[PDB]
Each structure stands twice: as C-alpha cells, then as structure tokens.
Amino acid sequence: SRVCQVTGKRPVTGNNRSHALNATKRRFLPNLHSHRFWVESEKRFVTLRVSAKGMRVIDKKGIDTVLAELRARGEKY
Template identity: 35%
Template sequence: MSKVCSITNARPVKGSKIHRRGLAKKKGGIGQHVTKAVSRTFTPNLKKKRIWVSELKRFVTVKLSTRALKTVTKNGAYATLKAAGVV
C-alpha cells in the first residue's frame, strides 16, 4: 500500500534528526552537544475516505492527506477529484 496522496501527491520524504546530549545551559547544565545526525522519513498524514460525489451519484474511495481533505471540503468533491485526475 503506497503512502501517496491521490490529490496533492504528498509522499514520504527523507530527512534527518539531530541527536543531542547533555543538559542545556539555561537549565543548569554545561550545554548540549550534537553527537550524530540520524536519517528518518517524514510521512504524510494519510486517511482512506469514501467521498460522496453528487455529480456521479456514487461514493469514491480515495487515499488523501488531511490537507487534501480540507481542499475537498473547500472546493467541492467533484471539482477537486477531477482536477487531480481521480474521476
């Protein structure tokens, strides 16, 4: 099952998390030190939704991000799905 949004094409991207060690100076420590940069993936917040399209008089099941769900609510289901090439 792919982790790609049907409307916005949001997909996982690679990034890094910086590991730090020690207590910050403002908290009474001797300062934080960077020990390593560890790779990680940032995944989109995907939901599988059944959206009622009144023009087609049927439900359409799509996997979309929560950002895309907001776009569907704002612009309408048929217009958004048609622009994305889903319908």
Template identity: 35%
Template structure:
C-alpha cells in the same frame, strides 16, 4: 500501496534526526493519510488523501 496522497501527490519527506550532540541519523516524516469515500464522476470511490487535502475539499464544499 505507497504512502502518497492520490489527490495532491504529497508523499514521504526524509531528513536527519539530530541528537543533543548533533549526531545525524536518517528519519522519515510520513504523510497523514486517511481513507475517505469521495464521489468522482458520479461514482463513490475510496481514496487515500492527506488531511490537508481533505480540509481543503471540505472548505470548498466539493
């Protein structure tokens, strides 16, 4: 299973980690995924979604 939000499609970002001497080494920023039970078309399903998407759904009361 990939680290990807099933609702928004948000996934891992990559870039450089910089030391004090400005040496570059590759690193990743993972998405904060949570497994949540969501009602989709009248059925309850477990979905991996980002916390940002979860906040948005709670705010819009969906």
C-alpha cells in the same frame, strides 16, 4: 505507495537531531487516510487515499472540482 491522490504528498527524508547534534537519517511520511467521499453528481461513494491536508482542500475546492483535476492527472481514482 504512500502518495496522496489529491496533493501528491509523498514521503520525504530528514535527520533525527539529538541534543548532541548527532544526525541519523529518517523519513517523514504524510498523514494519509482512506476516506469515502460522497460525490453528488454520480450519487456514489468514491474511496480516495488522502492526506489530512488533502481533506481540508476538498471542503474548499469541492469534491467534483478535485476529481476533474485528477482525471487530468490520470491517477485512476
């Protein structure tokens, strides 16, 4: 499903608000993208379904550090 493997972002629901303030239910989904991250330690490419916000944290946190947390989460990358 539409779940970020790094940040855990999932679809959320809200309202379409018109000029007349009419409210209709809608959904906000994350900006998810399948990316192949190069992990140096295994000299391999590992594909992750990540949001655009998740991509930014990968640079800050390092590819190896996030995967260590992922194994703790048991997400089965």
